[PDB]
Amino acid sequence: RIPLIGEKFPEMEVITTHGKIKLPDDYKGRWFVLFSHPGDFTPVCTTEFYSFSKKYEEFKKLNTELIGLSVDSNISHIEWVMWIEKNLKVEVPFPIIADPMGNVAKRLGMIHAESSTATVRAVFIIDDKGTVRLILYYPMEIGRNIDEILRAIRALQLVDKAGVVTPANWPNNELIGDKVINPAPRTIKDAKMRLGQPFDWWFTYKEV
Amino acid sequence: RIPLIGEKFPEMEVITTHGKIKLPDDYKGRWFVLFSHPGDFTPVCTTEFYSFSKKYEEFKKLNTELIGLSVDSNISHIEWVMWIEKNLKVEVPFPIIADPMGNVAKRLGMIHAESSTATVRAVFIIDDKGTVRLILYYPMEIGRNIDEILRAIRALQLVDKAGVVTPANWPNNELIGDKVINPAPRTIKDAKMRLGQPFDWWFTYKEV
Amino acid sequence: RIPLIGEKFPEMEVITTHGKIKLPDDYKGRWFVLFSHPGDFTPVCTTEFYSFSKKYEEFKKLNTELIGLSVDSNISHIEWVMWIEKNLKVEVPFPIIADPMGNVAKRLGMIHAESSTATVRAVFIIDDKGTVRLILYYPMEIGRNIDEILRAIRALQLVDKAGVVTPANWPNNELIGDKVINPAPRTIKDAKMRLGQPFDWWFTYKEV
Amino acid sequence: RIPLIGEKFPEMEVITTHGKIKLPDDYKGRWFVLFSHPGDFTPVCTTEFYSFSKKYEEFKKLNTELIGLSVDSNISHIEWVMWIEKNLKVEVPFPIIADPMGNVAKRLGMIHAESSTATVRAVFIIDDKGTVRLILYYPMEIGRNIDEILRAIRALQLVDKAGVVTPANWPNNELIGDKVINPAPRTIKDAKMRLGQPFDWWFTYKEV
Amino acid sequence: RIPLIGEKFPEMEVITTHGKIKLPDDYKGRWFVLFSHPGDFTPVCTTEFYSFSKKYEEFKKLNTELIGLSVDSNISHIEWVMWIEKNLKVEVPFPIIADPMGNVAKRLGMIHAESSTATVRAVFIIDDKGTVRLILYYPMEIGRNIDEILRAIRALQLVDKAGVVTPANWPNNELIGDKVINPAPRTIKDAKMRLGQPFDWWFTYKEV
Amino acid sequence: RIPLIGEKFPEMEVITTHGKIKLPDDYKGRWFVLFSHPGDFTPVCTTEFYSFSKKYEEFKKLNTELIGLSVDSNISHIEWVMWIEKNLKVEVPFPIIADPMGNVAKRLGMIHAESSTATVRAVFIIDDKGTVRLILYYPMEIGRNIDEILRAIRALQLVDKAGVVTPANWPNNELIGDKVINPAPRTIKDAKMRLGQPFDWWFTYKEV
Amino acid sequence: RIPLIGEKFPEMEVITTHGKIKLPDDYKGRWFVLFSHPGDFTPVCTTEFYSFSKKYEEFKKLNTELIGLSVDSNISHIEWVMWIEKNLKVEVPFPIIADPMGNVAKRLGMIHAESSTATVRAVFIIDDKGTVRLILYYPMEIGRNIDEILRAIRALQLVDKAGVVTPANWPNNELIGDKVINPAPRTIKDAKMRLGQPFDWWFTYKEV
Amino acid sequence: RIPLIGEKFPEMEVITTHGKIKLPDDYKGRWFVLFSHPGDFTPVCTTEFYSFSKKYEEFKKLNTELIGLSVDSNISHIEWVMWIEKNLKVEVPFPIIADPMGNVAKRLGMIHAESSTATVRAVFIIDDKGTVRLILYYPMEIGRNIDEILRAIRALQLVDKAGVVTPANWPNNELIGDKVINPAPRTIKDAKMRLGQPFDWWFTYKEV
Amino acid sequence: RIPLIGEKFPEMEVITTHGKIKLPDDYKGRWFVLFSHPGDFTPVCTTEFYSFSKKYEEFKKLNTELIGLSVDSNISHIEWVMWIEKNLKVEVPFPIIADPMGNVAKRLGMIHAESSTATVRAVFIIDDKGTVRLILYYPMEIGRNIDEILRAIRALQLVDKAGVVTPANWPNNELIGDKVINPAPRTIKDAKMRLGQPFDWWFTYKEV
């Protein structure tokens, strides 16, 4: 049923421009960003793939793989990738899932009310253990911000490492900038231990 | 049932720090950003409200109102707002919906699998006619990027005005920068009319 | 539910390379051949479209329109048609229905057990009053015989005109060649009236 | 439920002019063409049986057996076969399934909407492993083209042998005649390996 | 649901060697004997039709029409009737219902457990108002006694005329021969009125 | 389903200002008073907590623990407790259950018809074996009488010790004051044994 | 279904020691206390009726009527009342509802898990408009505190008059004694208007 | 469903030795005793009919009709009645309902667990308005007491006339003999009006 | 489900003026008469208990125990028994089942349509093996005839001893007085053996 933050990504086998892929598991110690686009040979989706491929190594340096998805035939994916390689001079280095009929698209709630024929601009961020960490549904008509996906992976990974929480617009928070936040105390014992620290006992910040 | 892009925002009456509000309709020619946060007096949600209130007038200049939401009592909202006004020196100028029991939260799919006691960081963007235009589910542990919400409203509004589509990372697209994209042709007549224009017949760009 | 010989073709509105089309009715005094192919840019489907477009005027002279269908996006149809026009030097003159998600494909039983991602090579022959007259399911891996579709329309139309029935391999039947067959008698009165005519009372042939 | 291309032919035992027959299995390394006709002693069905029996050895040389079927009593089959042997001077050498009540006919979707009392002209092509390979529903009023059934078996068998796909109207394709087609590449690696071959990378042809 | 003695014969339209017939009503002031036989060109059913046609005028003199029924095609009926006319030298003067698929046969409970492909030897006697008066199910393997059907119509008609009841083996009852029986008294008043008449008060006989 | 007098308190794990607590069992030889209040930082609920904390040791001397509950976040509980400690000069020494979403509140029937957003003033008295002994639903708008809860525990405990029953307003009954009542006789043997004692045989009193 | 605070008391007609009574309505501008007891001639229930009848005029001075209820026959009620009048020297002046079978008892959730044969000590307080204002379930074995029921009516009535809320143990609150509490502010406008008043902005007290 | 005391006797039409009878209504101002017996020509049932017919006029003088019932054919009833008239010298003057199949017997719960083939000795007493007043199920093996049925009608009729209640074994009660009893008082007003009359206020007796 | 003649009395445990009783079994070699009355302190039920207690030893001499039942509390039973002992000068020597809520009363079909608050005057006669032998439903308003219950036990016991059947009004049958009846013959062999005995072969009488 549509997956949510905290649930494990559903077991499913998909057919991609790089062969078959077994989806939560073939990426079982990496993060990955599964993202949909309406269709191949549309212009906005092309700018998005250009941007992803140009920024691919920042995705690799954060140990995440990209994997796209659309309701177009896997031959059309190959012809789209070939057009991109030769007109925009960049090679799309990640797999694109072909799902006509939209079975995996419906399973992840990627078909909305405004088109019955194509996905929206969905983005799932799955971590190294396969849990769904972040969900974005952008509409057809505006492209996504790829640097915001990177910013979110950095923050999500820092959370797993340092057991902290990132502030808003991190690492550019207008109150504490680069600094991260201590997870608020759970009992009254723990809370009193942090009294008189800057801001308040529930709002304490460190640096990393 | 959980609303999706294109559907009208569900009729519902809510109780907020500014009184009662009738939700899709009291904002019937403005845009608004309905957004949830886990709970009052948590630190990350505080940085998010600080950032929203500091950037409030850019939201106003785009004709959108902000409206928050959490499973906390409306008295706790008032005490949170008062703490923010006097420690961070800024007045929270938008209403905060109080929903304990989580009835409106469950109706908008804001409760996920990782906490049974609080919303995630959901963001809905509703337009001047009440249709849901954009949906974001950020997890509890990372704060949101508020400038990305603004960027998306700008783009969504430009789409409604000029009947165009924005490229990725607009207005900073690595192929066409500020320029917007012509919606691809629908029939074979229309497609041939655009042959030999830069990129290809489905990928044509103008300026605004 | 899957249509059958004698039933009226189901009311449905489809989106094609020639715009919108209202399917049983926009062809309300013509015959038409609705036919599916697995996907654009596959090789066998290309030879089939070449053959159809080269033989288009024999279809027109029998008052039938062609209309194709596949689970590919309508932009991919336009790009396929453009590739055909410029590599094989022929212009595809009939509409191609775009149905991703496969809603109209499932409704006509065009998805079989051997691929979950594409139609088979289905062929429906609908007459001037919209009734389904003939159904062919060819598999993905062999192309269709287009002259056999023409042969069947000729025969089906002669049946409607002369109230006869065509023999096997007509107009090349190894017993009576060009000649057509009288519909066998229904009662015992009618049967005795035809006794001692060549072959037998149920097997009588004329010429047209 | 009505069988489709790729599914195995349903297990069923039938009573024929040659005794009992166990249907998918008694033909377990041969191909066979199961085909229905409306009824014995109708004229068009007679021309079809004449044509099948005259062409029987081309069916045998392709390792396929013929087997007919109708809602008529098995005594009426024998009397029809005897009439054919002595008026048209040819012996019907294949079994004819007798199914009054129409149980096997309904199971294979051979009864349509235009007669509640007889089958249509259905044709199933089953291969040496029992999978349904091709389905034809011709109406009562036009006879079938038997040479087209042979053409389809030849092509289907060549596909199983050479792992190719036949073009339209094969072996008489107006682009490549006798030549068969290479199955289009599945991944982007495989596609680039075939660049600059005649037609395009998805449309490559050999000879056999 | 299977008709029973006293119920009206179900409305149904059937297709016979004499054209269409509307079954309970086209015989709306006559009696008729609807009877099934397994199939045309079987030997026992032939002797039964011979016997019926030879005795046809005794059926006519009792104001009853005969009408047969089998799961064989109406062309096979005509060919059976023609074989009978020329080998046994008698013309079958009554209609034979053709019902392949067996829809009317199943509706009258004429298909039993010993053959799934043919009716048994059912006999229904319907009167001038359409009520089912008598039901016989003889098996495939023994022919019927036609003089017993006549004997039963005579008795059933005498019952309707004289308000009596016929004894066993009438008109040859081993106690009272030709004589018929008075319907036994219903109340104790009526019973005492008949005391001391021959046999007893419930068993009184007259002559006609 | 809503618990009742005599049933065991439902197994449930709750999150409180003192950590996790496993509810019927962590108190498995003590009594406890589970009680709800509408919300933190409301005035009447504050007076109730003041009164409970001031009288805490009378609760301890009767071997009962207090444990509160509200639909407010556990951080808001801590901030409420801190406000009480420093304005009313008393430390709240018992755990407060945090249940937003109201799952445990709905399970104990603590949400009524007059507010859909907060509990009423429910009071459950559970004994040393975990059975529900007494249930009070006070409305939002009047505070509870805490000395009446103590009076009821004293009486309930005396019942368990001496196998008696307390009179009305005990220990201040206007007929027998401090004295307790003998449980009325169950059979007619037992009843006659108590005849002519003061009041009557069903109404006998002792002292403790 | 079991009534709750805020719901209107269910329409029902009952048979009492004072005749028939139509329950929510015959008391349509008075308050009333409907209360159950296990059974007549039990000792604790007797002390409770004594106490109620002795304090009857304080109930009358607060415009409330008393009405009792038990699963005992209405003749047994009369004999119990007569025993009370002559042994305890007081006349029971209020009606007692007789409900054997327990239909009204089950409808108000007065039968619990510890006896399948008698009610518990339930107490409902209904106001002049028929809404259920307060619910008490005391167990069989301890009698009720009648002065606490009076205290609650006084408070509930003061709430309806002065739009206030009573503190805990009112009119004997250990913080503000006789004084009542202002209902906490609902919006942030209203809250700031009360800043710097004693205790805090949500905790303000007046006198009556 | 099985009728009970107070319900109206179910509408039903029955076939009896006196013709058709419409059961609750043809007796619409008389009382009647509907009674079953296992079967005709059993010995105990014969003694019961003898006794009923001999006492018939006491039944008539109380304005009640008798009507019997058994699962035996109505001819067997007539032959049983005739045997009784001539061996026991008495004429059975009441109707006997014939119900083979037992449809009316099952509807009145007259078939029990000890025989699946015959009724028990059921007795229903219906009054002048058709309500069921008294139900007796005697077993097969003991005959009924007919004078007790008369005694019960006398008492039931006296109740309807004088609004009283008869004592046990009336008119031979060992405490008050012929005298009848006043229906006990319903309210406490009415009860006190009868104090100090003989026996007690609920036990008062008059004479008729 | 409501018990019937021949079924075993349902297992059930009941609470009576003599303690607990396990109902079919604690009487496992005695007969017993379970009988209901509407309520204690009603006048007719009192006369019935007087009569039962005065005749108790005739019940004991037939090896049957009495046991009563009503929807009144077991304390009210004791007070009723005490009133009877001292006003009517007789001690009620049998147990009275207390069933408020009416669970055992509904299980035995003792609540009818004329009062929803009390049983009717039901009488069950159970034998030494626990089978239900006789069922009486007398209405509220007439008392029962206790000598008729005794008469029925005598007859039922004689049946078990001598394998006979008692005539009507036995031992005072107007045809054969004291004499009992031979159970009618079951087969035609047995019947002829009794021909020419007084009355007839099915009606033979002996003496005991």
Coordinates of all heavy atoms in Angstrom, one line a residue, chain F residues 4-5 47 51 83 112-113 133 135 137-138 141 143-146 148 151 165-166 168-169 174 200 202, chain G residues 5 46-47 51 83 112-113 135 137-139 141 143-146 148 151 165-166 168-169 174 200:
Chain F
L4 N -14.3 -2.2 32.4 CA -15.4 -2.1 33.3 C -14.9 -2.7 34.7 O -13.9 -3.4 34.8 CB -16.7 -2.8 32.9 CG -17.1 -2.6 31.4 CD1 -18.2 -3.7 31.1 CD2 -17.7 -1.2 31.2
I5 N -15.7 -2.4 35.7 CA -15.4 -2.9 37.0 C -15.4 -4.4 37.0 O -16.3 -5.1 36.6 CB -16.4 -2.3 38.0 CG1 -16.4 -0.8 38.0 CG2 -16.2 -2.9 39.4 CD1 -17.4 -0.1 38.9
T47 N -4.7 23.0 39.3 CA -5.2 22.9 40.7 C -5.2 21.4 41.1 O -4.9 21.1 42.2 CB -6.5 23.6 40.9 OG1 -7.6 22.8 40.5 CG2 -6.5 25.0 40.3
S51 N -3.1 19.7 44.1 CA -3.7 18.9 45.2 C -3.2 17.5 45.3 O -3.0 17.0 46.4 CB -5.2 18.9 44.9 OG -5.9 18.4 46.1
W83 N 6.8 24.5 35.3 CA 6.0 25.7 35.7 C 5.4 25.5 37.1 O 5.3 26.5 37.9 CB 5.0 26.0 34.7 CG 4.1 27.2 35.0 CD1 4.2 28.5 34.4 CD2 3.1 27.3 35.9 NE1 3.3 29.3 34.9 CE2 2.5 28.6 35.8 CE3 2.5 26.4 36.8 CZ2 1.5 29.1 36.6 CZ3 1.4 26.9 37.6 CH2 0.9 28.2 37.5
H112 N -15.1 12.0 25.2 CA -16.6 11.9 25.2 C -17.1 12.8 24.1 O -16.4 13.1 23.1 CB -17.1 12.4 26.6 CG -17.0 11.3 27.6 ND1 -18.0 11.0 28.5 CD2 -16.0 10.4 27.9 CE1 -17.6 9.9 29.3 NE2 -16.4 9.6 28.9
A113 N -18.4 13.2 24.2 CA -19.1 13.9 23.1 C -18.9 15.4 23.1 O -19.2 16.0 22.0 CB -20.5 13.5 23.1
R133 N -11.4 -1.3 39.6 CA -12.2 -1.3 40.8 C -13.3 -0.2 40.9 O -14.2 -0.3 41.7 CB -11.3 -1.3 42.1 CG -10.6 -2.6 42.2 CD -11.7 -3.7 42.3 NE -12.3 -3.8 43.6 CZ -11.7 -4.3 44.7 NH1 -10.4 -4.7 44.6 NH2 -12.3 -4.3 45.9
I135 N -14.7 3.6 38.5 CA -14.5 4.4 37.4 C -15.3 5.7 37.5 O -16.5 5.7 37.8 CB -15.0 3.7 36.1 CG1 -14.1 2.5 35.9 CG2 -14.9 4.7 34.9 CD1 -14.6 1.6 34.8
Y137 N -16.0 9.5 35.6 CA -15.9 10.5 34.4 C -16.4 11.8 34.9 O -17.7 12.0 34.9 CB -16.7 10.0 33.3 CG -16.1 8.7 32.7 CD1 -16.9 7.5 32.7 CD2 -14.9 8.7 32.0 CE1 -16.4 6.3 32.1 CE2 -14.5 7.5 31.4 CZ -15.2 6.3 31.5 OH -14.7 5.2 30.9
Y138 N -15.5 12.7 35.4 CA -15.9 14.1 35.6 C -15.7 14.9 34.3 O -14.8 14.6 33.5 CB -15.1 14.7 36.7 CG -15.6 14.5 38.1 CD1 -15.9 13.2 38.6 CD2 -15.8 15.6 39.0 CE1 -16.3 13.0 39.9 CE2 -16.2 15.4 40.3 CZ -16.5 14.1 40.7 OH -16.9 13.9 42.0
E141 N -15.1 21.0 33.0 CA -15.4 22.3 33.6 C -15.4 22.3 35.1 O -15.4 23.4 35.7 CB -16.7 22.8 33.1 CG -17.7 21.6 33.1 CD -18.1 21.1 31.8 OE1 -17.3 21.3 30.8 OE2 -19.2 20.5 31.7
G143 N -13.4 20.7 38.6 CA -12.3 19.9 39.1 C -12.8 18.8 39.9 O -14.0 18.8 40.4
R144 N -12.0 17.8 40.1 CA -12.3 16.6 40.9 C -12.1 16.9 42.4 O -11.4 17.8 42.8 CB -11.5 15.4 40.5 CG -12.0 14.8 39.2 CD -11.0 13.8 38.5 NE -9.9 14.6 37.9 CZ -9.2 14.2 36.9 NH1 -9.4 13.0 36.3 NH2 -8.2 15.0 36.5
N145 N -12.7 16.0 43.3 CA -12.4 16.0 44.7 C -11.4 14.9 45.0 O -11.8 13.7 44.9 CB -13.8 15.8 45.4 CG -13.6 15.8 46.9 OD1 -12.6 15.4 47.5 ND2 -14.7 16.1 47.6
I146 N -10.3 15.3 45.5 CA -9.2 14.3 45.6 C -9.4 13.5 46.9 O -9.1 12.3 46.9 CB -7.8 15.0 45.5 CG1 -7.4 15.3 44.1 CG2 -6.7 14.0 46.1 CD1 -8.3 16.2 43.4
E148 N -12.1 12.5 48.0 CA -13.0 11.5 47.7 C -12.4 10.2 47.1 O -12.8 9.1 47.4 CB -14.2 12.0 46.9 CG -15.2 10.9 46.4 CD -15.7 10.1 47.6 OE1 -15.9 10.6 48.7 OE2 -16.0 8.8 47.4
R151 N -10.8 8.5 50.1 CA -11.9 7.8 50.8 C -12.3 6.5 50.2 O -12.6 5.5 50.8 CB -13.1 8.8 50.9 CG -14.2 8.4 51.8 CD -15.5 8.8 51.2 NE -16.4 7.7 51.2 CZ -17.4 7.6 50.4 NH1 -17.5 8.4 49.3 NH2 -18.2 6.5 50.5
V165 N -18.4 -4.5 53.7 CA -18.9 -3.5 52.7 C -19.1 -2.2 53.4 O -19.6 -2.2 54.6 CB -20.2 -4.0 52.0 CG1 -19.9 -5.1 51.0 CG2 -21.3 -4.4 52.9
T166 N -18.6 -1.1 52.8 CA -18.7 0.1 53.6 C -20.1 0.8 53.4 O -20.6 0.8 52.3 CB -17.6 1.1 53.2 OG1 -17.9 1.8 52.0 CG2 -16.3 0.3 53.0
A168 N -22.7 4.1 53.1 CA -22.7 5.4 52.4 C -22.0 6.5 53.3 O -22.2 6.6 54.5 CB -24.1 5.9 52.1
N169 N -21.2 7.3 52.6 CA -20.4 8.4 53.2 C -19.4 7.9 54.3 O -19.0 8.7 55.1 CB -21.3 9.5 53.8 CG -22.4 9.9 52.9 OD1 -22.2 10.5 51.8 ND2 -23.7 9.6 53.3
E174 N -24.4 8.3 58.6 CA -25.4 8.9 59.5 C -26.2 7.9 60.3 O -27.1 8.3 61.1 CB -26.4 9.8 58.7 CG -25.6 10.7 57.7 CD -25.8 10.2 56.2 OE1 -25.3 9.1 55.9 OE2 -26.4 11.0 55.4
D200 N -31.9 -5.8 60.6 CA -32.6 -7.0 60.1 C -31.5 -8.0 59.7 O -30.3 -7.7 59.8 CB -33.5 -6.6 59.0 CG -34.9 -7.4 59.0 OD1 -34.8 -8.7 59.2 OD2 -35.9 -6.8 58.8
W202 N -30.6 -9.0 56.8 CA -29.7 -8.6 55.7 C -28.8 -7.4 56.0 O -27.9 -7.1 55.2 CB -30.5 -8.4 54.4 CG -31.8 -7.6 54.7 CD1 -33.0 -8.1 55.1 CD2 -32.0 -6.2 54.6 NE1 -33.9 -7.1 55.3 CE2 -33.3 -5.9 55.0 CE3 -31.1 -5.1 54.3 CZ2 -33.8 -4.6 55.0 CZ3 -31.6 -3.8 54.3 CH2 -33.0 -3.6 54.6
Chain G
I5 N -20.6 12.1 28.3 CA -20.7 13.5 28.6 C -20.9 14.4 27.4 O -20.1 14.2 26.4 CB -19.5 14.0 29.4 CG1 -19.4 13.1 30.7 CG2 -19.5 15.5 29.8 CD1 -18.2 13.3 31.6
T46 N -29.3 0.4 51.2 CA -30.2 1.1 52.2 C -29.6 2.3 52.8 O -30.2 3.4 52.8 CB -30.6 0.0 53.2 OG1 -31.3 -1.0 52.6 CG2 -31.6 0.6 54.3
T47 N -28.4 2.2 53.2 CA -27.7 3.4 53.8 C -27.7 4.6 52.8 O -27.9 5.7 53.1 CB -26.3 3.2 54.3 OG1 -25.4 3.1 53.2 CG2 -26.2 1.8 55.1
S51 N -29.5 8.2 53.3 CA -28.7 9.5 53.1 C -29.4 10.4 52.0 O -29.4 11.6 52.3 CB -27.3 9.1 52.7 OG -26.5 10.3 52.8
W83 N -40.2 -0.8 54.4 CA -39.3 -1.2 55.4 C -38.5 0.0 55.9 O -38.2 0.1 57.1 CB -38.4 -2.3 55.0 CG -37.4 -2.8 56.0 CD1 -37.5 -4.0 56.7 CD2 -36.2 -2.2 56.4 NE1 -36.4 -4.1 57.5 CE2 -35.6 -3.0 57.3 CE3 -35.5 -1.0 56.0 CZ2 -34.4 -2.7 58.0 CZ3 -34.3 -0.7 56.6 CH2 -33.7 -1.5 57.6
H112 N -21.6 -4.4 34.8 CA -20.2 -4.5 34.6 C -19.8 -6.0 34.6 O -20.6 -6.9 34.4 CB -19.4 -3.6 35.6 CG -19.4 -2.2 35.2 ND1 -18.3 -1.4 35.3 CD2 -20.5 -1.4 34.7 CE1 -18.7 -0.1 34.9 NE2 -20.0 -0.1 34.5
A113 N -18.5 -6.3 34.8 CA -18.0 -7.6 34.6 C -18.0 -8.4 35.9 O -17.7 -9.6 35.8 CB -16.5 -7.5 34.1
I135 N -20.6 11.3 35.0 CA -20.9 9.9 35.1 C -20.0 9.2 36.1 O -18.7 9.4 36.1 CB -20.7 9.2 33.7 CG1 -21.7 9.7 32.7 CG2 -20.9 7.7 33.9 CD1 -21.4 9.3 31.3
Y137 N -19.2 5.5 38.1 CA -19.4 4.0 38.3 C -18.7 3.6 39.6 O -17.5 3.4 39.6 CB -18.9 3.3 37.2 CG -19.6 3.5 35.9 CD1 -19.0 4.1 34.8 CD2 -21.0 3.1 35.7 CE1 -19.7 4.3 33.6 CE2 -21.6 3.3 34.5 CZ -21.0 3.9 33.5 OH -21.7 4.1 32.3
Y138 N -19.4 3.6 40.7 CA -18.9 3.0 41.9 C -19.2 1.5 42.0 O -20.2 1.1 41.5 CB -19.4 3.7 43.2 CG -18.7 4.9 43.6 CD1 -18.5 6.0 42.8 CD2 -18.3 5.0 44.9 CE1 -17.9 7.2 43.3 CE2 -17.6 6.2 45.4 CZ -17.5 7.2 44.6 OH -16.9 8.4 45.0
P139 N -18.3 0.7 42.6 CA -18.6 -0.7 42.7 C -19.6 -1.1 43.7 O -20.1 -0.2 44.5 CB -17.2 -1.3 43.0 CG -16.6 -0.2 43.9 CD -17.1 1.1 43.4
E141 N -19.4 -2.8 46.5 CA -19.0 -3.1 47.8 C -18.7 -1.8 48.7 O -18.5 -1.9 49.9 CB -17.7 -3.9 47.7 CG -16.9 -3.3 46.6 CD -16.7 -4.2 45.4 OE1 -17.6 -5.0 45.2 OE2 -15.7 -4.0 44.7
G143 N -20.2 2.1 49.5 CA -21.3 3.1 49.2 C -20.7 4.4 48.6 O -19.5 4.7 48.7
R144 N -21.6 5.2 48.1 CA -21.3 6.4 47.4 C -21.2 7.5 48.5 O -21.7 7.4 49.6 CB -22.3 6.8 46.3 CG -22.1 6.0 45.1 CD -23.2 6.1 44.1 NE -24.3 5.2 44.6 CZ -25.3 4.7 43.9 NH1 -25.3 4.8 42.6 NH2 -26.2 3.9 44.5
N145 N -20.6 8.6 48.1 CA -20.5 9.9 48.9 C -21.6 10.8 48.4 O -21.4 11.4 47.3 CB -19.1 10.5 48.9 CG -19.0 11.8 49.7 OD1 -20.0 12.5 49.9 ND2 -17.8 12.0 50.1
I146 N -22.6 11.1 49.1 CA -23.7 11.9 48.6 C -23.4 13.3 48.5 O -23.8 14.1 47.6 CB -25.1 11.6 49.3 CG1 -25.7 10.2 48.9 CG2 -26.1 12.6 49.0 CD1 -24.8 9.0 49.1
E148 N -20.7 14.5 47.8 CA -19.9 14.8 46.6 C -20.7 15.0 45.4 O -20.4 15.8 44.5 CB -18.8 13.7 46.4 CG -18.0 13.8 45.1 CD -17.4 15.2 44.9 OE1 -17.0 15.8 46.0 OE2 -17.2 15.7 43.8
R151 N -21.9 18.6 45.8 CA -20.8 19.5 45.4 C -20.7 19.6 43.9 O -20.4 20.7 43.4 CB -19.6 18.9 46.1 CG -18.3 19.8 46.0 CD -17.1 18.9 45.9 NE -16.3 19.5 44.8 CZ -15.5 18.8 44.0 NH1 -15.6 17.4 44.0 NH2 -14.8 19.4 43.1
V165 N -15.1 28.0 35.5 CA -14.7 26.6 35.8 C -14.2 26.5 37.2 O -13.6 27.4 37.7 CB -13.6 26.1 34.8 CG1 -14.1 26.0 33.4 CG2 -12.4 27.0 34.8
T166 N -14.7 25.4 37.9 CA -14.4 25.4 39.3 C -13.0 24.7 39.5 O -12.6 23.8 38.8 CB -15.4 24.6 40.1 OG1 -15.3 23.2 40.0 CG2 -16.8 25.0 39.5
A168 N -10.1 22.4 41.7 CA -10.2 21.1 42.4 C -10.6 21.3 43.9 O -10.2 22.2 44.6 CB -8.8 20.4 42.4
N169 N -11.5 20.4 44.4 CA -12.0 20.4 45.7 C -12.8 21.6 46.0 O -13.0 21.9 47.2 CB -10.9 20.2 46.8 CG -9.9 19.1 46.4 OD1 -10.3 17.9 46.4 ND2 -8.7 19.4 46.2
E174 N -7.2 24.5 47.8 CA -6.0 24.9 48.6 C -5.1 26.0 48.0 O -4.1 26.4 48.6 CB -5.1 23.6 48.8 CG -5.9 22.4 49.1 CD -6.1 21.4 47.9 OE1 -6.7 21.8 46.9 OE2 -5.5 20.3 48.0
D200 N -0.8 33.2 35.8 CA -0.3 33.4 34.5 C -1.5 33.7 33.6 O -2.6 33.8 34.1 CB 0.5 32.1 34.0 CG 1.7 32.5 33.1 OD1 1.5 33.3 32.2 OD2 2.8 31.9 33.3

